[PDB]
Design a protein around this ligand. Sequence first.
Ligand SMILES: [Zn+2]
Ligand SMILES: [Zn+2]
Lengths: 62, 114, 899
Amino acid sequence: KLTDIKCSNVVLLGCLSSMNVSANSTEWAYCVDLHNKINLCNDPEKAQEMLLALLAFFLSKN
Amino acid sequence: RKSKVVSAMHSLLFGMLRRLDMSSVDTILNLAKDGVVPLSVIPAVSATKLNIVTSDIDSYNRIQREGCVHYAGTIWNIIDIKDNDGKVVHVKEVTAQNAESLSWPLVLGCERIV
Amino acid sequence: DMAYLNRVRGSSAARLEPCNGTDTQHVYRAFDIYNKDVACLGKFLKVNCVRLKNLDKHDAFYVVKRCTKSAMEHEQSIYSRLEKCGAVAEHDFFTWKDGRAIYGNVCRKDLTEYTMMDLCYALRNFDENNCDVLKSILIKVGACEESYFNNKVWFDPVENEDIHRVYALLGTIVSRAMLKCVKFCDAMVEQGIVGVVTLDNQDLNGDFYDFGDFTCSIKGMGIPICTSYYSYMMPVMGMTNCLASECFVKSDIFGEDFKSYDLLEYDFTEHKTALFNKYFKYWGLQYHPNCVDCSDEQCIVHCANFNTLFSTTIPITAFGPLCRKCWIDGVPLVTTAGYHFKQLGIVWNNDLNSINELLQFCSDPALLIASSPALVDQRTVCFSVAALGTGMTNQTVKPGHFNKEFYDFLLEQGFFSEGSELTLKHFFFAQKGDAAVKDFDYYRYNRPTVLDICQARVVYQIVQRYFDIYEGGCITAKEVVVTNLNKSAGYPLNKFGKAGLYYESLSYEEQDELYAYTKRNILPTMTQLNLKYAISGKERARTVGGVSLLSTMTTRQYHQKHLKSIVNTRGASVVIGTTKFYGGWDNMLKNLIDGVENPCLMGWDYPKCDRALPNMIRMISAMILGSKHTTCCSSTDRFFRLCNELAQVLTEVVYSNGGFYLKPGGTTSGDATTAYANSVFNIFQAVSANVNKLLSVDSNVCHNLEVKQLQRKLYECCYRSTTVDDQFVVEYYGYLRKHFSMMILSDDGVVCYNNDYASLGYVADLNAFKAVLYYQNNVFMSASKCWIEPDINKGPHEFCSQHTMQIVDKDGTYYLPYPDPSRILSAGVFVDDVVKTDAVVLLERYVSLAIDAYPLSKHENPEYKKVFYVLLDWVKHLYKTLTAKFWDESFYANMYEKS
RNA sequence: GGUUGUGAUUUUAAUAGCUU
RNA sequence: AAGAAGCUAUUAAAAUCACA
Ligand SMILES: [Zn+2]
Ligand SMILES: [Zn+2]
């Protein structure tokens, strides 16, 4: 479970990285913080909700 | 290869000489003991342009008081302000408290006024 | 009882309270007693003095020594001779009746609770618990109210940078104490008394109060010896940042109250020498402001330590390369002409100025920096120098690629199930747009540290013995082994091409000429700091130095022989060159465990090792490695090589993201000798814990005549003599090798110490390491990360990031390393960048991981065993999609078999 | 633009050597 | 016999991993 979501985050950043999202520092920092903190996350549902936040953010930029 | 590398080194060295600001250095260099000044302070005393990277609005407040900055025993006027993204940011926005919504590490391009 | 008190009360207005009546208080107290029976710096129990709390002052105490009736006249006369000076506490002398005879009484007034020794000792020998004395002293001095200790990590220097603020308050006490000691020594000289002065003789108020062992002599002919006084507090003298009251410039750089021409001052020779005479008038040993004047490499250690202590008072901008305008290429440009090392002092280039000659100019920062606008950055406490014309630009980190197929296969095999105790724990964390600079800010932990020279000269001698086996010397350019096409050459040269281009560009004769030049001058260079794609188990970013080309070319040409001798040797106490394959790991652990009686294993690691490295001990290591150029180079050449090594590696201008900086200190991973220098550092720290613990053994209680003799000789060699006798050094080297065996790799190692000698404090247990790291590395070794192992059979809990297990076979019992399963799985799953087109690269990755994972096959845990076989099956599948060299497990089996 | 060390593996080439 | 390969190392380069 954790691994399932934990790995799933990496692909999301890669998708974003292709979109030069780093052009604006704020969004890139937000995404990086969320990813890094979910990776260290040990209890699933919290990781799940941060992953949902990531996905919601990505869907905004398509 | 040998010719190309040494030629490129010559070109870079000549570029440095071009951007050296030769006169300003000597005017202050030869006052010190035997004309020897630490390299760590030569630009701050001889350079014409000054860049500063703030951490937040509070650093902005401390560093400047009326759009000018005091550093290395000299007064520096703020010409242009860039944010993280490099976009122009005018003094009106930073002065206002609303800068909270703005990217924090502002960088200011300051110039020497004597 | 009150009758006895009445004598004291009369003069003191009777505003006193007794502790448990007239009975002497049973309290342990630090001491520095050198005597026929004892020669120790540990604490003892003395019950020959009564302590009365002065109720007037919040801390003052009245202490009376009711002993030595026959010594009253001696004490009385000495006090009369010395009372005139202002550094002696008040004394009262009288005799009181008791039983069948009278005994003398010496009452000392308004003395503070704890002696300066009790501080210097307590600050050293620090530990998490049993730290009552330090807390009490901090409260009494008013550094912080007791509420400050609710923060259970208050003492940690890396978790509470506020602690340094607390200690800085004690800086006043230390400075006052030194000044009072100077006055007291002067008074002893004038009055004609001879004797040694020890911290037990002085109170926090700074007044001396005990004269029992002193001796009278001709007026003005006295001789005080304070070697152990000054030297002992030197770590405290550096930690609590005393002398801050002597700061040369007392205004901020960007504060309006400042002068432009002020910065140009760099000499500070008179400042430093005047400070030395003001505070250290009685140090006996000469002080050289500029180390270039030193003669013996040991003298450099002493003078440079003192320069480090005074380094605080000088402006931070004064240091750095010393350049000047000069006529070059017909265009007058600023040229480097000298360097102002923090420790070594002013050094000027011997020779004044062809590709051999012209090449250095393009790499020397002197030309580049002067041609750039100035830069002030508030992100990092470290200083900033200038910024290029193009302006600053940040750089970000992208996460690694996720290999979905491998993950799916792992899931299929049944891993990462809801069963616990196994899961991914390493990932390619991503970092912000400018994490490069914010990581460089971590060098603020590199606070100046002053190691006590008297006790560190001996340790330098000892550690030098650990490195006498190898061989060094200089080698002509043609003989240097070069990893050509080095992936970088530093900012000045990385534009044109890789390092090879320059290697074949420069013919060997020019390289030799440049080396000979370096043996006469100083040639500083940048070091382009940069980020590092690398899996990690924690969010922290990682960056590496990447020193420029010219440094490595000459640096390796000076150390190569020594380093090669280090790697090639086997069985030594430094195991850099040894392989863990072919049973090498078991050979290492068998050598380490050999000889030690009642063996027990311990380990550790230095927090923030690369950064917290006290920029002094790095210099010491730089001298040890180079110490073997006995004949190839004269002393001056050796000194210039050392200072150039420091210039390139310690205080070099560090480029990054278009914004120059000036590194406070600490190591740079890009150096050739980083691993070797760190190994020397680690040996130094491990030894020094031994000397520290040994001196505090409470000689009177010991019975191992060997150990008693050993500490008596050690003490008599540290403080009470000038030249250390090689005899004692070799004896101590043997003693350490007989009960404290070390195996050191770069900056990590394991120790197999005798349990008995450690329990009685005859060798450095963990607590010793806590103390030494605290007052010398200036960081705190969190008890969690270290460990001990009271049974060798289980082997080390971890060494070099790998566990160890014992397996019994037809070959018998022997040890095998095995990495953490989670780390291996993770390395399998994630890759730094998108896999290249050729899947063969994947085959190499996975076969190498299997090789590193084979030992788990023997592991006890059923789940761990699955790891190796699963990786084997994956490589089988990969190859099939694309053999015995890879198909068969036996191929991995032979990798972990002897010969 | 993506460091230097020290192990290790794989390939490739050269070098000889051995065996068939 | 040549020749041929196989094997064996040694050397060199690349590629790749682990470790600090
Ligand atoms: Zn000296
Ligand atoms: Zn030499």
